[PDB]
Ligand binder design. Structure first.
Ligand SMILES: [Cl-]
Ligand SMILES: [Mg+2]
Ligand SMILES: [Mg+2]
Lengths: 415, 415
């Protein structure tokens, strides 16, 4: 007669980025589950969604009924399909998977069908103010054993970032990108020039291919920064550089434009870190408009819907590339990886390296060894949280600044 | 030098249903705006989204720049397109429209282009345990001057409701619908039989058209309760009864099925009270798969996005029917109606009659006279809130019961 007894939210920032973790307790002594609910920009609203709504929904129920709980949970507020709602559901769903693995004495990847590969290949982020600094940073990552890298010159749209809420790191604006002149007064924002950015990208990859060759795999993230036809043209101009993928050429609001892109370009495309709705990803995958699906697993509602998405992708020849930024807890990192190891159609795993504090707060972080991640074989997600240590890193709260992105004339843009 | 000085949430339940209202104060003495943020099932998370995120985003800004504030606010948390996020934005957006009207000395409908009609026709809800009870209820509403009515026998799926969080009224289960026998043990939920429900609807309308004739307009709400092909067959069998519309024959997750429905049936269709994402409504409107769009204005982000939706619908010959349940504040009722008065493609206004406490807490409620609503000509939304009186009706909070809908075998179903 196993029952959920308690559900709680833990808010912690050991890597300098606000995280939300759900812990689900049961009436079996010592048996609990952990899940990721990290929507970093709205952590307090996520906490409210869990504590005020998911907790009374769950206490008393048999945690082994993961699918029933997910299906009933998703419709429990009637309205649904949003990032706050989905993250609250995810924390619950991953915790239940964690509990199921612990009961079975099996890692989640074994519950899901077992290992389809011997390690998880990773990509990491490289940046710089000019092409030489990017090149230097790639060399350093290659020395560490990375065989795949994302290359940005000036973060997103060439703008860099001063906002530590984004990745806990300041990144330089592109040094030599010359923006258009703005009007005589400016509304506050982080200014960028989408056209100057777009033209800089082929020049960057020309330099990088010249210096580093074609063995190393390259990723570039457009991050919805340009008009769709500009993104199409960029995809075409980048064909010669043979990117592993070109990421987020359009906003989710503009997914129809991928119909045109895919008639003209053979540069591999990834989309979807922003997706929260089946009506965003289903038309893309059904029509083969992408080669990699990029969802943030917690933001689509956890392991249960991510595995459905992985299967839907697999049957259409689309591969997975789950979102792996700084704004994901080590629990969510483990969840991505259990999916990765058990999916036939795994593509790549984006990885943001952790500091000592994250490894200390979350015992059981995956082993990173020469560009591959190696999950432990402990039951469930193989991850724990030290609640006392978590409390040493309280969340900063507040609002980000980087999301106020303005084009030269002052237009508020999708960031 | 006009600036926003304070943004706050008011939670009140004068009609027995939890409401969320946003009040935006400015540095001009006595000038403020009110907006609806009512997502009733998640009011505390909406409150968190406003108080922790919208408030610091807005203080100091010029409230006259409604579009800039909307466009920048919607992407401020990066992830977007969800019911909690959108309601927080709506509260702000409607309050800014209210402020703009007050500054202009004109109602919002006048800022939007003026009256397109002389009054707003309404439909109200009628229910009953059997056909004769529904008939009697319709007669009573026709005597009050309603010329359009929604007709349900047992609320949604024939199940009725005992949950006061839904519409603050207990409604009888359909008396004569015989469900399939369930398994020998049952998981808790509100049980219904989709097939017994579906067969009962044509029988209801056969009775109602015989007794009441064809002058009176009838609406029926399927409320996502049946399989898509069952919905298609229902639409076909109801053609002879000439419904004003058949509402929500499919879930948002199943919108593709409307392609098949519209090849076979000429029953008018409405969809969309559940919509939160452009990728849900845009394919429907682009392909003329519905005749009326049903969005809950606050849940799509306020007046700014609702006006865009109304225009997009107008150009495709689709008409508006904004959601008008019990779970919308009188501020939201006013916002619906200002859109209604100024839209060339207005279709109908669903209306849930208010009690004395709602009228007392919210001075300026629209005048209801013989089946039409008559907005006052006061500036902005023409509505106010008495905060001291609102405080006499604290919110109940908690989670609803009705959203746990199960079919005879125990399957958790979209409610
Ligand atoms: Cl949301
Ligand atoms: Mg990205
Ligand atoms: Mg409805």
């Amino acid at each position: 007669n196993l029952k959920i007894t308690n559900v709680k939210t833990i808010l912690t920032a050991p890597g300098g980025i606000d995280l939300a973790v759900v812990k689900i307790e049961t009436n079996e002594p010592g048996l609990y589950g952990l899940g990721c609910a990290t929507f970093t920009q709205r952590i307090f609203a996520v906490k409210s969604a869990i504590d005020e709504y998911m907790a009374p929904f769950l206490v008393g129920k048999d945690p082994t009924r993961i699918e029933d709980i997910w299906q009933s949970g998703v419709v429990s507020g009637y309205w649904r399909n949003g990032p706050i709602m989905n993250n609250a559901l995810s924390g619950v769903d991953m915790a239940l998977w964690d509990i199921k693995g612990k009961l079975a004495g099996m890692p989640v990847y074994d519950l899901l069908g077992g290992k389809c590969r011997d390690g998880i290949p990773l990509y990491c982020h490289t940046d710089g103010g000019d092409e030489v600094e990017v090149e230097d940073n790639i060399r350093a990552r290659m020395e560490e054993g990375y065989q795949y890298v994302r290359c940005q010159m000036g973060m997103y749209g060439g703008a860099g970032t001063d906002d530590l809420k984004l990745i806990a790191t300041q990144l330089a604006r592109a040094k030599n990108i010359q923006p258009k002149r703005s009007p005589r007064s400016k509304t506050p924002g982080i200014y960028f020039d989408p056209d100057a950015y777009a033209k800089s990208v082929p020049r960057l990859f020309d330099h990088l291919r010249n210096k580093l060759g074609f063995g190393i795999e390259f990723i570039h993230d457009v991050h919805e920064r340009v008009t769709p036809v500009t993104a199409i043209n960029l995809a075409k101009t980048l064909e010669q550089y043979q990117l592993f993928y070109l990421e987020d050429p359009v906003a989710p609001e503009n997914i129809d434009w991928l119909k045109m892109l895919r008639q003209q370009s053979s540069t591999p495309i990834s989309m979807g870190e922003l997706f929260v709705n089946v009506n965003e990803w289903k038309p893309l995958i059904d029509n083969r408009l992408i080669d990699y699906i990029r969802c943030h697993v917690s933001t689509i509602g956890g392991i249960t819907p991510a595995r459905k998405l992985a299967v839907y992708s697999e049957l259409n020849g689309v591969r997975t590339a789950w979102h792996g930024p700084g704004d994901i807890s080590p629990v969510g990192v483990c969840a991505n990886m259990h999916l990765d190891l058990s999916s036939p159609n795994f593509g790549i795993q984006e990885y943001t390296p952790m500091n000592d504090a994250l490894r200390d707060v979350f015992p059981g972080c995956p082993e990173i060894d020469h560009g591959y991640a190696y999950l432990n074989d402990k039951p469930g997600l193989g991850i724990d949280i030290d609640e006392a240590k978590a409390a040493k890193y309280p969340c900063e709260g507040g609002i980000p600044s980087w999301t106020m992105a303005r084009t030269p004339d002052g237009t508020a843009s999708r960031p």
